[PDB]
Chains A and B, each alone.
Chain A
């Protein structure tokens, strides 16, 4: 008899508040926890 249970409940909710450049760092969430450097500088300028 072999029994196995797997559960990976990983979630997030970034709060990024430039109107247009909001989407970038917030949607970069897939498999990229750390935000891009150049994208962060662009959002800072925006």
Chain B
């Protein structure tokens, strides 16, 4: 007899053991980045004679 999730299974002659394992790990890496830059140059010159 072999039981997996309330279901009766068969172990063949070549397989030693087939056991469901939980083994769960997930990683989630999010990146956010912004850069701003501004430049302004007003120049005015007047001459009268």
Give the contacts of B1-49 with A (CB-CB under 8 A): 20-40
**Complex Cα distance A17/B23, Å?**
6
Of A10, A13, A17, A29, the contact of B22 (CB 8 Å cutoff): A17
- Expressed in whole angstroms, the minimum distance between the Cβ of B37 and any Cβ of chain A is 6
Chain A positions near chain B (C-beta within 8 angstroms): 1-19, 22, 26-27, 29
Q: Which residue of A lies closest to B21 (CB)?
A: A19
Q: Which residue of B lies closest to A26 (CB)?
A: B26
| Between-chain CB contacts (< 8 Å), 16 pairs | A1-B39, A1-B40, A4-B36, A6-B32, A7-B32, A7-B34, A8-B32, A9-B30, A9-B32, A9-B33, A11-B28, A11-B30, A12-B29, A13-B26, A15-B24, A17-B24
Of B23, B26, B35, the contact of A5 (CB 8 Å cutoff): B35
Of A6, A13, A19, A22, the contact of B34 (CB 8 Å cutoff): A6
